[PDB]
Design a protein around this ligand. Structure first.
Ligand SMILES: Cc1nc(Nc2ncc(C(=O)Nc3c(C)cccc3Cl)s2)cc(N2CCN(CCO)CC2)n1
Length: 274
């Protein structure tokens, strides 16, 4: 596990903080995989983060979570190998589709997309694993509208950057994450609510897109104060009222009032059809 010389590099797919992903072919006719390797400018800190991500990823084994197929971590150079998800991230994919009138996507397909994210998150919750950056940009799309959640690191405007602070996806963040940096399964539910809003919007608009970062942060202060001045994402045109109410439960002020992923999954697979 795994002979590096079996890998044939084809195209660079993307790039993050301590790694670079490439499309590769495996001889082992044409098997495609995604391969993450260190960036050319990698430091010893990047090598350490890459080894950790290997450890984190090795534990995740579910149909709707990206799966580690293999590793080069013994003799150099370091590599991580996953399924190649041929349709890219879900944000770009939904951006290229329009909702069916009466490349298109049906409303029941939007539900099926959301249900797969909810099942993936259901699995993470059983492991008490907190994702901290659930969004359509961190979901990958395979064949037959198969969704795998990644942890994935472009979408610069989706993160609030202050020097010397962690980079924060504030528009997906529960009011208590913004005010206190506390991330829990309950805050992943709130982000799931925002992710479901993105799916039903077909990624046509940034969440709170007409509000500044500072207004989004002061809106978290309004959830805290609980004086009826907090503001929510509006109902997407493709979204019925019943499904909108489910998004609103994800954005309950009280963390314990937010539905668990098992309930969100049931609703989107079953109740949402009626
Ligand atoms: C950014 C991107 N990724 C794609 N597929 C991937 N599969 C798996 C990926 C991945 O990163 N694995 C991974 C690894 C290896 C280690 C740790 C963690 C992880 Cl999650 S990335 C396809 C794609 N394209 C598809 C075709 N589009 C046509 C548009 O018109 C263009 C864009 N673009």
């Amino acid at each position: 596990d795994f002979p590096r010389s079996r890998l044939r590099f084809k195209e660079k797919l993307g790039e993050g903080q301590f790694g670079e992903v490439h499309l590769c072919e495996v001889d082992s006719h044409p098997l495609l995989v995604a391969v993450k390797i260190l960036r050319p400018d990698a430091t010893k800190n990047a090598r350490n983060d890459f080894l950790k991500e290997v450890k984190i990823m090795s534990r995740l084994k579910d149909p709707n979570i990206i799966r580690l197929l293999g590793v080069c971590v013994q003799d150099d150079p370091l590599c991580m190998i996953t399924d190649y998800m041929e349709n890219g991230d879900l944000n770009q994919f939904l951006s290229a589709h329009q909702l069916e009138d009466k490349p298109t996507i049906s409303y029941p397909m939007l539900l099926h997309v959301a249900a797969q994210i909810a099942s993936g998150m259901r699995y993470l919750a059983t492991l008490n694993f907190v994702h901290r950056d659930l969004a359509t940009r961190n979901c990958l799309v395979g064949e037959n509208f198969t969704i795998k959640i990644a942890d994935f690191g472009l979408y610069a405007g989706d993160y609030y950057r202050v020097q010397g602070r962690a980079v924060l996806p504030i528009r997906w963040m529960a009011w208590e994450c913004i005010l206190m940096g506390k991330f829990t399964t309950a805050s992943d539910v709130w982000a799931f609510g925002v992710t479901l809003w993105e799916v039903l919007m077909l990624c046509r608009a940034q969440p709170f897109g007409q509000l500044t970062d500072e207004q989004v942060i002061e809106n978290a202060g309004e959830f805290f104060r609980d004086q009826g001045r907090q503001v929510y994402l509006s109902r997407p045109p493709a979204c019925p009222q019943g499904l909108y109410e489910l998004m609103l439960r994800c954005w309950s002020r009280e963390s314990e009032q937010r539905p668990p992923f098992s309930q969100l999954h049931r609703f989107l697979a079953e109740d949402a059809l009626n």
